[PDB]
Amino acid sequence: NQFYSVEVGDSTFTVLKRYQNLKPIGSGGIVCAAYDAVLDRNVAIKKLSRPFQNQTHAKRAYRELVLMKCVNHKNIISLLNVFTPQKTLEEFQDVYLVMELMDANLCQVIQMELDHERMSYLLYQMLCGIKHLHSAGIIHRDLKPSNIVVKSDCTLKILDFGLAVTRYYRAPEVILGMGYKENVDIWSVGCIMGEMVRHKILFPGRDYIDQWNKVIEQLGTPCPEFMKKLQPTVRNYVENRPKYAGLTFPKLFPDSLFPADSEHNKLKASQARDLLSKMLVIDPAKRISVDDALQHPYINVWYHTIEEWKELIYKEVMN
Numbered sequence: 001n002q003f004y005s006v007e008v009g010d011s012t013f014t015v016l017k018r019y020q021n022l023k024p025i026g027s028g029g030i031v032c033a034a035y036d037a038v039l040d041r042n043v044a045i046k047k048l049s050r051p052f053q054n055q056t057h058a059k060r061a062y063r064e065l066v067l068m069k070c071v072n073h074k075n076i077i078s079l080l081n082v083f084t085p086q087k088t089l090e091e092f093q094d095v096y097l098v099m100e101l102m103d104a105n106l107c108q109v110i111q112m113e114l115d116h117e118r119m120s121y122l123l124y125q126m127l128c129g130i131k132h133l134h135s136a137g138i139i140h141r142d143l144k145p146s147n148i149v150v151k152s153d154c155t156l157k158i159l160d161f162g163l164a165v166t167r168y169y170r171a172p173e174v175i176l177g178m179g180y181k182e183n184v185d186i187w188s189v190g191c192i193m194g195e196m197v198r199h200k201i202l203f204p205g206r207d208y209i210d211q212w213n214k215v216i217e218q219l220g221t222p223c224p225e226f227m228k229k230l231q232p233t234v235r236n237y238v239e240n241r242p243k244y245a246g247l248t249f250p251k252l253f254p255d256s257l258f259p260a261d262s263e264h265n266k267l268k269a270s271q272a273r274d275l276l277s278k279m280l281v282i283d284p285a286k287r288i289s290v291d292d293a294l295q296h297p298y299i300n301v302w303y304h305t306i307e308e309w310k311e312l313i314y315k316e317v318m319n
């Protein structure tokens, strides 16, 4: 037997003997930290439970399985290993994904007071990864702090590959479903950046109705040429919400929320606030591109059926 089993709270992790001393570290299914005897270093292990239980799970599991192996960048997860304990296609039940062990989630980092030095290096790293995915034909469209991990030395990796549930970081074009470009991902990075400053979710809501409301109060009702690109029915809903004027960015992010103890930090606040207002733009036509955000002075400092899916996945776990 090359495997063994151990409980981590009703979740049985049956894993290769190389992986030792399991300990839970997250569930946004189930993920463990472990020592890997062969590599003499620490790894994270995530177990997909019967990832082929429906079209949804199976389509994502399969796509993420393929790409994670297929895509190669320092700011994007990669697998050190993939395995299933089950020996046959018939008995096949679970997939385990193994990655280099990271120390924290982005939720955790946003809770800290952070300097511009670390906040800007984290943003720089999201743009690089997001940049990379785009160059590969992957527009993510679902960036959030929970699918982004961090090491103590502030190196950052994106954990998943997007759409092909936390909704706060989704762009207007996703909230309204209207067809998107690469810079749909820039909205999300703008939401993340803002939360880092404000320490509250920029656009919360029970659903997309409340959500869009939060967007228009703070940013104001968008201009006419933006509306002209919304389909008849959604366009009607948008134009008919009470129209707001929309706070400016100094009001949205008062100096209070920035270090003002030196000139460096004063300049850095100004630049930060300037980038937030290019990212947090409702109309994609007028929202900043990834390549440009990487140029910003705040940033540039760092330059088909349950049966069928089962088999498709299995092959890929075999491979």
Ligand SMILES: N#Cc1c(NC(=O)c2ccccc2F)sc2c1CCCC2
Pocket: 025, 026, 027, 031, 044, 045, 046, 077, 097, 098, 099, 100, 101, 102, 103, 104, 105, 149, 159
């Ligand atoms: N490393 C790491 C890590 C997580 N990893 C994963 O979710 C994961 C995703 C895909 C493949 C493997 C894997 F461990 S989840 C999580 C962490 C670090 C602590 C916060 C929660």
